[PDB]
Amino acid sequence: YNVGKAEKDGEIRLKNGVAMSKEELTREDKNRLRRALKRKRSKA
Amino acid sequence: YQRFEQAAAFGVIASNANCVWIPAPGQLITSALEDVNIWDIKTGDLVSKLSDGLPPGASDARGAKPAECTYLEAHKDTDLLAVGYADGVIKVWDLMSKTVLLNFNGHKAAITLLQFDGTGTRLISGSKDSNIIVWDLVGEVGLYKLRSHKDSITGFWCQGEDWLISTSKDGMIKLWDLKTHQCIETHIAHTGECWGLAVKDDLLITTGTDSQVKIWKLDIENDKMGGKLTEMGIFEKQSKQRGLKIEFITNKTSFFYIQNADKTIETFRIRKEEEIARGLKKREKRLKEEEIAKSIKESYSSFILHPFQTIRSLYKIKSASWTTVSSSKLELVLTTSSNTIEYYSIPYEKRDPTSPAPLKTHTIELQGQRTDVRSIDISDDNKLLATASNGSLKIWNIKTHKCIRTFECGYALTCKFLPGGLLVILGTRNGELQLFDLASSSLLDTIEDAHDAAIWSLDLTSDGKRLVTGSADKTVKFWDFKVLKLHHDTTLELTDDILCVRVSPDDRYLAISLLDNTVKVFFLDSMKFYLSLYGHKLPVLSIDISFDSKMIITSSADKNIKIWGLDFGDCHKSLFAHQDSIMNVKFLPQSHNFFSCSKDAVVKYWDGEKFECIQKLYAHQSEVWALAVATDGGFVVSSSHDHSIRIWEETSLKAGERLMEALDLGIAEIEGLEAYNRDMKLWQIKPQGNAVLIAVNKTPEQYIMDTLLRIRMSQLEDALMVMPFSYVLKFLKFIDTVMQNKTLLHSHLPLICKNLFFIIKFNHKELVSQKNEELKLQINRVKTELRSALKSTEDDLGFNVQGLKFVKQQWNLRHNYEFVDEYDQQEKESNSARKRVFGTVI
Amino acid sequence: KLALATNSPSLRIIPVPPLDVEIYEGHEDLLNSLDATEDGLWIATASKDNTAIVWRYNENSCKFDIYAKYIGHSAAVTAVGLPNIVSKGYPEFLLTASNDLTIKKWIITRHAHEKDINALSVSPNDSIFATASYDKTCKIWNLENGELEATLANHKRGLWDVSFCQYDKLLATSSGDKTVKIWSLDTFSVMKTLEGHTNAVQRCSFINKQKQLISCGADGLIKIWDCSSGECLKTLDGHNNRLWALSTMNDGDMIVSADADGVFQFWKDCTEQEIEEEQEKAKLQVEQEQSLQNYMSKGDWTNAFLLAMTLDHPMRLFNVLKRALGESRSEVIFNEELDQAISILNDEQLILLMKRCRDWNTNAKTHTIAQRTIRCILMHHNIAKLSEIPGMVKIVDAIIPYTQRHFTRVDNLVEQSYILDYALVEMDKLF
């Protein structure tokens, strides 16, 4: 078992098992998570 | 090679911002664009206005639109006027000294609401992004910021240092507590957004989008979800548009009004307890003539409320404010969309409107235009001739900045100026051509059906004897001025709708701008098609000719001025500017330096021989429409869709070291406190905590633990090798304090273990050489607590492993049918066993 | 009641919700086309027999009067129409149209087309009349005269139905091929083309909201789209072989679709109640989310945990469990109220909690919280129930080996701390 990406679309699941919902973030952390996803998808 | 700066402003009585009324009717404070006007209602004259330090048009003026005035609010007890401008800046002026004294910029959007207590000297600002910011005037800083909404701020009410209630377009009401500095409660107000919020201490009024107001109860109850704020009433049918503002007045009866979007403002009245009693007993009669009781509890809304009347104003409204006296007359100062102010009065006897309609008086409309200016002319460096859409022609003078007279002609398209007698000649959107005066009676002529559709442009020779007009009936009509009537000498028929005409200043050429994107050029005495200018990709909107009739400027709908020569018809230059569309170009009367005005609100002043932008001008924000230059002197006039008229005149320790310093601080503090405690036991003076701990709000053991966490795990062994043995002893004292603060121990149990075992494994020889009973007791306690913590986590893990193994084995027992034959069971498990792929070389 | 012109020589009346059938007979040959007034009590029947008859209805004693008879011509009457009624109850006329190339407009006769006609629609203002056929055209004429007002020209391979959008006043035509055409009375030019359909439309109509057009389809389907841009809003697939008939109750938006086969369904508008229930769920959600944040900040770990498990907010759930452990560091494993809440947890919440606990069990920093909540589940639930929950064995198979690895690591850590013990030994030996 490895912690894969989340099942639903309203969630964000990272590689160390720290899951988050889309309804429990501030807009600042939302933007920083979008930037991290952007750079990871931009290379890999 | 001169500079140009603006020096005037006209026509803007009131723009997109609120109005603040001051008593002695009193006077009104309204907003121009990056400017605030204040005037009496008795006469309507500018008693003051607030500019800024440097004028726009200087080189130090930033080449962007100066932000508008968006909100303004005054405290008369402190004689101050705070103002919020649309790029998020807060200024404060006086009215006596009328000078800026401090400045705020916390927000990054438009500024919507300003509520300030000059009593408390607190200014609470709600902007167009989602944060509310509480500033302190005497502190001049940003005190704090409540940011929890997700669209904007449009409803707003503060009380004491306790509560703050705001309604935002993510259509909900949030109740903030200011002491704990956070939002306690939330309620969805309406389905979409919600704008208006009016707070009496008992009831609360929240409008929506769909003619629906909601009546709420407010308390200070201790409950979590209800108690504070409840939803007692729903009332319908104000008007089908949206309700924008709710403002609430007292004397006792009380009133309020809902300011809608359309022409109507609806004033309502709230009644008293004896009428409450009469209503409930009459509804009790309706009851006798429980489900009907809760039906009455539904009609509670109309039971409380009472529609007083309406004010059906003119075309549209922008804002309003209350002015009531004697509980017998109530008045509303209202600013409209177009530049009018109106004072509305209502007499009443606490029950009845006593009138079929509110009386409209004290209206200020003169110095404004009441609609947008389409055409502009200048008169002999002495007068200005503006004209707009509602028939309003207007004549202004540059010295005292006021009007002279006013006409009505319909949708006006072009005004020109005959210097003989100083007459005005206007051509409309109806196919007609009127002619008015200034000294004599108002109107001379309305030549009707000059063309069958909208004429588009007009000019006349320097002699003033023949006019030429161009109209969308494919027609160019040449007229003569006979002595004071007008005949049509000749009519030229063309192929496309002509969009512009221009006669050369030296009576030579006649340029025609045709919608099939071309420019014909005729000889003025012969009409012989001397030239054709081609290739603008879009219809040309403005043509001008140089003073010597040698260079033609032509400007079109595709953002590029084309300069052609009149000696052969060769385009000298294309020149791209003005990101939307250029609407006018105008030469100087002396040489080849021109001005260009466009639909992106920039007035660019070019040199022609160099083909260069000498200057950019950033007066206003909406679309420029008209431009005219002085005949001799050289002032410039530009008029724009915000009803604005501008007149321009010329002039680092490493890891290891950081751990050592933090260990120093922490062990110093711990030893000081324990020596004080030993002295307390001797008694049976507290030493002050250090600056960093009292500044970060951390116990010293958590401070040391935090610097251990800041040390990155690639250099930790090098750090613990760098530090010497005195700091090793201090480290052991720190771990003793952790074992006494057991929850830190279990929350950071791995790291503490690794660092302790590594330090002891390095320094084992000298530490065992030392002889110290405090070391012996410290290491005994650390050993015991470490075994306790690790055996606790180990017992948890072992219990869990045995339990989950039992559960899984029991389910396999229940739901895995065993094949008795061994090879079949082997193949069953080897088929159903989990697989995995890997990339090998052969 | 619902009036049915099937392929049987008897009009059929059925109540709409459904078994009882009224069968009325007027002529030997099968019915071919049916029409009703807007107010019920008047219906018009065209059969394969040349007779076309109009029935009065009577919701007293149940009468179905056959009172109007029309012999007409010597062909099959294929379509009928009557737009309106006078106040006294005599609808002004009846316009029917035939198997052969003629029509007739008889009080209570002109050439029409080349091939057989398809359908007859009426105007709301009772003045103009539309009629198409298989010859790629439609025609519109007067009601007081047979003078042809206009003619819509052409198509690929035919037309199948015509209708009048009454509010917007548009001409809709179900084509012969796989499309629908929408025209307007101003210039009679192509206002809207409706495509995306599969085989053939065979019926087109307006909606009671005056903004959505409905197209049936011979591939056994139904499309409802907005007419502003011509883009699909919904597509219904309750049928299996064909579509033949579609009718609508206006006030309560109740459409009914029937095919060549016997399957026979009624759809009803419910978007109002859908949006209502959605906004109620949104209101309840924002209320309990605000309550979650307030409980979280103020204490109340049990109630915050309950709201986090009902809302599925795993980050706040993890922080609740970590704070509860940090509190009860001082055989209870948390707050006792929290333990009672976990003992009164349910099935799907157990699957959710064990799934998230497996996730936290992955890394080495949160394995402690994962072990505590697993131990609490075990100490306060029934092992048989845990084994019988579906998927719990998959989750336990994912959980176990990480716990074995954590066990070995902590064992090695204790083995290391015996260096502290050895240092004590030698120090006490020296002194």
From Swiss-Prot, chain A:
Transmembrane segments: none annotated. It is found in: Nucleus, Nucleolus. Involved in nucleolar processing of pre-18S ribosomal RNA. Required for the early cleavages at sites A0, A1 and A2 during 18S ribosomal pre-RNA processing. Component of a heterotrimeric complex containing IMP3, IMP4 and MPP10. Interacts with snoRNA U3. Component of the ribosomal small subunit (SSU) processome composed of at least 40 protein subunits and snoRNA U3. Interacts with the SSU processome subunits EMG1, IMP3, IMP4, KRR1, NOC4/UTP19, NOP1, RPS4A, RPS4B, RPS6A, RPS6B, RPS7A, RPS7B, RPS9A, RPS9B, RPS14A, RPS14B, UTP1-UTP18, UTP20-UTP22 and UTP25. Belongs to the MPP10 family. This is U3 small nucleolar RNA-associated protein MPP10. It comes from Saccharomyces cerevisiae (strain ATCC 204508 / S288c) (Baker's yeast). The lineage of its organism: Eukaryota, Fungi, Dikarya, Ascomycota, Saccharomycotina. The chain holds residues 496 to 539 of 593 of the full protein.
Swiss-Prot record, chain B:
PROSITE patterns: WD_REPEATS_1 (PS00678), WD_REPEATS_2 (PS50082), WD_REPEATS_REGION (PS50294). Present with 9620 molecules/cell in log phase SD medium. Involved in nucleolar processing of pre-18S ribosomal RNA. Belongs to the WD repeat WDR3/UTP12 family. WD repeats lie at residues 64-94, 106-136, 148-177, 189-217, 368-397, 407-437, 450-480, 535-565, 577-607, 619-649. Pfam families: Beta-prop_WDR3_1st, Beta-prop_WDR3_2nd, Utp12. Its main location: nucleus. CDD domains: WD40 (cd00200). This is U3 small nucleolar RNA-associated protein 12. One of its GO terms (molecular function) is U3 snoRNA binding. InterPro entries: G-protein_beta_WD-40_rep, SSU_processome_Utp12, TBC1_cilium_biogenesis, WD40/YVTN_repeat-like_dom_sf, WD40_repeat_CS, WD40_repeat_dom_sf, WD40_rpt. It comes from Saccharomyces cerevisiae (strain ATCC 204508 / S288c) (Baker's yeast). Interacts with snoRNA U3. Interacts with MPP10. Component of the ribosomal small subunit (SSU) processome composed of at least 40 protein subunits and snoRNA U3. The gene is DIP2. GO terms for cellular component: 90S preribosome; nucleolus; nucleoplasm; Pwp2p-containing subcomplex of 90S preribosome; small-subunit processome.
UniProtKB/Swiss-Prot annotation, chain C:
Signal peptide: none annotated. The keyword NAD does not apply. GO terms for biological process: endonucleolytic cleavage in 5'-ETS of tricistronic rRNA transcript (SSU-rRNA, 5.8S rRNA, LSU-rRNA); endonucleolytic cleavage in ITS1 to separate SSU-rRNA from 5.8S rRNA and LSU-rRNA from tricistronic rRNA transcript (SSU-rRNA, 5.8S rRNA, LSU-rRNA); endonucleolytic cleavage to generate mature 5'-end of SSU-rRNA from (SSU-rRNA, 5.8S rRNA, LSU-rRNA); maturation of SSU-rRNA; maturation of SSU-rRNA from tricistronic rRNA transcript (SSU-rRNA, 5.8S rRNA, LSU-rRNA). Its main location: nucleus. Keywords: Nucleus, Repeat, Ribonucleoprotein, Ribosome biogenesis, rRNA processing, WD repeat. Interacts with snoRNA U3. Interacts with MPP10. Component of the ribosomal small subunit (SSU) processome composed of at least 40 protein subunits and snoRNA U3. Present with 8070 molecules/cell in log phase SD medium. This is U3 small nucleolar RNA-associated protein 13. It comes from Saccharomyces cerevisiae (strain ATCC 204508 / S288c) (Baker's yeast). The chain holds residues 352 to 817 of 817 of the full protein.
